[PDB]
Amino acid sequence: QTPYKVSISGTTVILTCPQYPGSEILWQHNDKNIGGDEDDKNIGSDEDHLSLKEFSELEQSGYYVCYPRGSKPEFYLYLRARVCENCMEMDVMSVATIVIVDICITGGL
């Protein structure tokens, strides 16, 4: 089963539902509909995605669901990150790449 795809870049948060070869793509999050509208600008309506601009790291965190049209609430996602308005995720994997790249470029210098 090909999984979800969540990317965090700047203030923008996007979710993907590649679990369907077509049909319909509708979103819900915390028992309400999102992404079906387009006239509002901080969220996106996409052919396969839910797009969030200026994602509230404290408020917009919750359960996200993928829909084919006509379905009912009864593959889910629970999403949390710090998005604020310029912050990302410098996870512990890249600690060396953050704190010793300085020494490495210093040695090159």
Next chain:
Amino acid sequence: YKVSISGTTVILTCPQYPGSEILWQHNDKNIGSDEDHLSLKEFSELEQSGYYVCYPRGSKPEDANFYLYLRARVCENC
């Protein structure tokens, strides 16, 4: 409002409403305070960070037109 950086004693001025006495609704005068000035010594950020405001004499808790929130700590030389 105006502030000072130097030392463990902090100082701030409330120029609002001159000509009448001034009263503070939070952390009013251990503490010295003049007619338009408040002096605080040994300021701990732990228990003294909150809302602050200065009121004129003959005023009630609803009359404020300005407000202040703060969080600071000492420097002892600065």
Next chain:
Amino acid sequence: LSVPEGENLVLNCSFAIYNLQWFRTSLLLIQSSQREQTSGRLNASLDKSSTLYIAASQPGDSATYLCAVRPLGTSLIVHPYIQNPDPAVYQLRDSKSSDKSVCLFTDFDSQTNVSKDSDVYITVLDMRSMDFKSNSAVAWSNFACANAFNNSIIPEDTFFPSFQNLSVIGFRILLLKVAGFNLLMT
């Protein structure tokens, strides 16, 4: 009820009802005539003329439970399994602007739970982040804890003693270089 983690848990609530819910939020929900509900890890066999089951309990499940009825709470403590109790008492660094000291008693066993002096006050921590859980309690006053944690039977092997953050982790090398110029200029 007093069990360690990983154990099977069965709980009974005592009283043709139409509405009934077991509150941790609603978890057990009964319909008009449904006999079985299943979700999470839990079982639910119903008889209104009513069960919940945890196959492998965890201390996070420890909570006060209530049952709701309609015309026509009960607390549960779940204990950890530390796999190595290490009972011990220590004092904590008292911050400035406080004329008090605090004591701590932790890492002990379930049966080894915990003032006698005129001016000391004494009181599950299911921190699953550490993949185990422990129990803790504190005593504070005006102060070596040796005489403080003294009212309870600790075992003889108890151990006694004798964003900014990101920034401060950052400029270590800058300080190492102010160490440089101030000595390279010599």
Next chain:
Amino acid sequence: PIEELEDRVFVNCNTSITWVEGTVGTLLSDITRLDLRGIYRCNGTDIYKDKESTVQVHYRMCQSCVELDPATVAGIIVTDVIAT
């Protein structure tokens, strides 16, 4: 799905895991639960029997992230290099 552990990528599952190893992580004594980009998936049965639930996550909260403006951190990183 996933529950709170205040800093953890821990996942709350009632059945064993299926994962792609970009990073190894560590699992609980309850082998159904996993803690730690890599793809890690759960797999559930209680109300989905004859089917399955699935979860792929971005790491819950952050044990290692901070709110910041990189411009207001770029220079404070460049300190140690201008000091060279």
Next chain:
Amino acid sequence: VTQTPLKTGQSMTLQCAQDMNHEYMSWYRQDPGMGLRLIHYSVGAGITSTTEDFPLRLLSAAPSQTSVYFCASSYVGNTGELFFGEGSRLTVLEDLKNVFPPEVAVFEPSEAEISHTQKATLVCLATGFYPDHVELSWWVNGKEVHSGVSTDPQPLKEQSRYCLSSRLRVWQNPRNHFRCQVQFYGLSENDEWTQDRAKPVTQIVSAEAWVLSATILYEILLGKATLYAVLVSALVLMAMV
């Protein structure tokens, strides 16, 4: 379900709103730690004005209330799920000499703790303020934390003065930095108080102990070196000129 947001005898209005068109809509108050109790429900206009906003209002604030609040909604009989929302607490004061803005204290463990159990414990203490209407909420990472925290609803009277404590146990990544807080629903801006020993408004206080101030002092040590190092490195520019 959404929810937003006191001298003895004061009045206040509470709000809760829904977009689910629920007809069965009620209120709920919880004695912190042991009990939860209910307030009557209204199904529509005329009986007990709009199925959306169902506000709650106080007739007379009393110190004996001492509980948190909940407003719940659900459809009638289709499933039975009594969905809940967030909550807030009340504070009624025999004010002046009894109520103070909270003074909050937080500590750090010993070296032998971390050495022998490898997993430290952090604790926050707050001295009480008559009456027993006290709150406490830890705050790390940008959220109120409910996992791995102890809470005791009664501020332990000492003689009178009070104190209450909570534990937050946990380090290979020192990026972790802690804080302690307490939410005080103090007196409103529109109630009387004598400016001598003046009035604390509804406030949230902060306490931090993660090296409590050692990191901050080591940071300030920079400005204790950077400017003068730059000055000695730049004074040579006279010869360059």
Next chain:
Amino acid sequence: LCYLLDGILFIYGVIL
């Protein structure tokens, strides 16, 4: 709980 170790760092830089 590292400030001690920066202390030995300082003394060792001194003797170095």
Next chain:
Amino acid sequence: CYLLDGILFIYGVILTA
């Protein structure tokens, strides 16, 4: 900090010298 735990053995090199 702990980065210099193996560098704590600049005690070692002077011992060799």
Next chain:
Amino acid sequence: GNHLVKDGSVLLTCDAEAKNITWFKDGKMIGFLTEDKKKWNLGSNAKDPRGMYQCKGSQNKSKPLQVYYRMCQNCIELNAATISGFLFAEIVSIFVL
């Protein structure tokens, strides 16, 4: 009583109705917030966000609010222990004269 404006991140909540929240920075329009949000981004409280702010909805405006914070230019605890450190550092650095 009016006053609609009230980790280390600091955010301000305007208690106005969920139809328009508008934020005035230093007495001027700076930004607009939607109904799905309820907080205004100031960032970390340590990044000197000092200023006077106030929010507006469908009404006129609320009581203005002001706060000051700093990057900790004066954030110290000068006990004899830290006294030894900074004093010795100063003297050893200046001994070059």
